[PDB]
Amino acid sequence: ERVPEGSIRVAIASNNGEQLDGHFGSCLRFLVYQVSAKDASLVDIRSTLDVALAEDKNAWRVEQIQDCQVLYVVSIGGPAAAKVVRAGIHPLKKPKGCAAQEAIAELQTVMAGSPPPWLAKLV
């Protein structure tokens, strides 16, 4: 899908259900949500299984979320984060972990309030 205007794609690093409990470098999959200031929907679940076959692992991981504008992790290495950033994705962390829904809700408070220009343009 070509995201609909007014919305963005959000990747969440995860190992269980719809939890934001994964570390970038070792997560089982990326939950991908379509999020607007007011609405959010789970659109894809991208498994990281095939990273086992990659020689350039961080590059591969980022490739799985190349269409996301934001990425949530519990944690992420410096180098990994640089690649995430180089891809134009904004990495956000939640060191203690939480429900994907809670992170998205938080992200929406920004979108709905005073989003920075980059985000405002989107939404």
Automatic annotation (TrEMBL):
GO biological process: nitrogen fixation
Record bears the keyword ATP-binding: no
Domain Dinitrogenase iron-molybdenum cofactor biosynthesis stretches: 17-108
Name listed for the protein in its UniProt record: Nitrogenase gamma subunit
Organism of this sequence: Azotobacter vinelandii
Domain of life: Bacteria
Positions spanned in the full protein: 99 to 221 of 243
GO function term, MF aspect, one: metal cluster binding
Family: Belongs to the NifX/NifY family.
Keywords tagged on the record: Nitrogen fixation
UniProt lineage: Bacteria, Pseudomonadati, Pseudomonadota, Gammaproteobacteria, Pseudomonadales
